Amino acid sequence: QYAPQTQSGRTSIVHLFEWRWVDIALECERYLGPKGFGGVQVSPPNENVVVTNPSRPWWERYQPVSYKLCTRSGNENEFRDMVTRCNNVGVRIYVDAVINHMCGSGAAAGTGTTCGSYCNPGSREFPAVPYSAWDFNDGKCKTASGGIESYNDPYQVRDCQLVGLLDLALEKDYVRSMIADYLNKLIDIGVAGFRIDASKHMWPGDIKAVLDKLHNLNTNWFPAGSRPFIFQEVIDLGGEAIKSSEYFGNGRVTEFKYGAKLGTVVRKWSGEKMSYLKNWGEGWGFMPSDRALVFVDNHDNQRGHGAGGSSILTFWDARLYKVAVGFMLAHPYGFTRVMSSYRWARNFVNGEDVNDWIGPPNNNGVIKEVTINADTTCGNDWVCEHRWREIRNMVWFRNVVDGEPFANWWDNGSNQVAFGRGNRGFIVFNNDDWQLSSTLQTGLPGGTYCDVISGDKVGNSCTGIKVYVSSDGTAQFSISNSAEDPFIAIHAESKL
Numbered sequence: 001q002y003a004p005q006t007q008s009g010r011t012s013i014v015h016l017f018e019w020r021w022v023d024i025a026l027e028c029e030r031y032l033g034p035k036g037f038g039g040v041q042v043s044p045p046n047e048n049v050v051v052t053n054p055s056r057p058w059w060e061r062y063q064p065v066s067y068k069l070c071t072r073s074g075n076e077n078e079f080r081d082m083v084t085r086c087n088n089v090g091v092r093i094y095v096d097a098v099i100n101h102m103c104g105s106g107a108a109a110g111t112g113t114t115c116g117s118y119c120n121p122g123s124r125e126f127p128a129v130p131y132s133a134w135d136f137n138d139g140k141c142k143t144a145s146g147g148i149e150s151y152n153d154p155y156q157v158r159d160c161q162l163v164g165l166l167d168l169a170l171e172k173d174y175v176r177s178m179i180a181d182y183l184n185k186l187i188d189i190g191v192a193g194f195r196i197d198a199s200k201h202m203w204p205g206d207i208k209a210v211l212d213k214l215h216n217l218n219t220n221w222f223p224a225g226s227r228p229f230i231f232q233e234v235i236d237l238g239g240e241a242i243k244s245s246e247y248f249g250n251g252r253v254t255e256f257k258y259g260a261k262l263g264t265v266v267r268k269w270s271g272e273k274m275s276y277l278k279n280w281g282e283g284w285g286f287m288p289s290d291r292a293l294v295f296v297d298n299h300d301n302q303r304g305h306g307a308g309g310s311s312i313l314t315f316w317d318a319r320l321y322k323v324a325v326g327f328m329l330a331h332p333y334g335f336t337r338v339m340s341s342y343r344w345a346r347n348f349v350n351g352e353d354v355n356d357w358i359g360p361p362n363n364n365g366v367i368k369e370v371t372i373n374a375d376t377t378c379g380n381d382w383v384c385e386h387r388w389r390e391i392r393n394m395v396w397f398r399n400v401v402d403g404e405p406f407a408n409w410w411d412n413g414s415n416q417v418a419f420g421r422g423n424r425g426f427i428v429f430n431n432d433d434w435q436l437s438s439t440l441q442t443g444l445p446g447g448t449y450c451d452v453i454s455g456d457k458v459g460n461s462c463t464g465i466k467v468y469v470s471s472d473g474t475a476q477f478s479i480s481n482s483a484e485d486p487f488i489a490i491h492a493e494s495k496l
Ligand SMILES: [C]=C1O[C](O[C]2[C]([C][O])O[C]([O])[C]([O])[C]2[O])[C]([O])[C]([O])[C]1[N][C]1[C]=C([C]=O)/C(=O/[C]2O[C]([C][O])[C](O[C]3O[C]([C][O])[C]([O])[C]([O])[C]3[O])[C]([O])[C]2[O])[C]([O])[C]1[O]
Pocket: 059, 060, 061, 062, 063, 098, 103, 104, 105, 151, 162, 163, 164, 165, 197, 198, 199, 200, 233, 235, 236, 240, 300, 305, 306, 307
């Protein structure tokens, strides 16, 4: 539940949003294993309805029609092969469990599903599971529309239909047992844990009854009595009836205040300043660090779905995005999840992108493979942020400094900020519109360190900036506000 189950000393997961199972296994072997990534959150592995208007949106995968492992990402054999191949190189797989609902209630009856199962959403018939009309919450919901009309009433957000999706009656043992069996089939293949989708739309105790039915992890890869890692998706920015803390007994919770506040601070909106990040973490009103899964953006709010709104930084704001991700990866708070996206054509009318439905790169509906270019970037409009040097090297810095205290904070009173992590890593940021020239106490042994944002340590040299720290730990840093990446990070393993 709160222990991530990563191989020892791997501290981040990557969401490889809409990637095919064959591409994720090859990425585990050629890249994620070698570069120290802890694991991968994958898209929903179970069968979904095919949505033709608009043509194949990313969100049709959030409309279950059975628990068959049969999707545009692949079939069951390809899924099992990906989970074996990643586990064997020390990279864990986390499944997005869509267990609150089936598909939308106005979807058409038939076999337009990703594996050909039949369903009749209007009569609530899902013969491939099987579910029937008494496995849903239509009678339990008291609103006129049957949907969630107010997030100020706990009963309607848990018992009514979220954007018209058929709401499962999770208090019944039948539904509980049907979901537990799907999830145990996944654990047996070798999955390490689950993102529980739309946890806010389910009662904490029904989630707990499902969790109590789950198997220990597969001992080919995991220790004796290991329990699945669980993180629950609950959007709680405040101001509503449901709080994150109601879900803390079940496992970790998505802290959505983290990317909303960080975005604002880094964009310097509302009078926010990077020097205010001195007390970042619970000091800013976030949940306990041991309960939180943290991220700058997720698949929903990078395209304006969910919540986060305008301050969320994404790959579209690359320079500011890298300083937000570098700060998140250097700070001790939370378990970190990094985003990996595909590019879509945005079209804003009245400040909203009306193209936020567009699904993954595809050729007439079949998802295009991730091609790797000679310069290690991806092709086919996969943007592969997890492969950007600055992000790549900061997931490594987090593994090097794991368990080290926040130390040696400095700020210039405005937007230049620096801090270390024990005597093992130090990062300095300049988000002011003038330059930085300070001699800072780093806490590291004296020596020449390669900056891992502008470069790499290759043999006995650096490809980028070289920082000398003197015998007492201080080092002079100079960073222009016009720099490519306005921040420098050095750690025990980038010492020459
Ligand atoms: C998204 C989200 O949502 C919600 O959140 C909320 C928001 C919005 O409303 O707001 C705020 O304020 C609050 O607070 C919050 O809470 C919920 O909660 C969550 O959970 C979500 N997220 C999640 C979930 C889901 C489901 O599964 C998803 O979603 C997606 O998908 C869907 C389905 O497909 C869609 O929808 C669609 O379809 C439908 C049918 O049924 C219709 O109706 C519509 O229109 C369409 O669109 C949506 O949209 C999407 O988003 C997600 O992804 C996850 O993550």
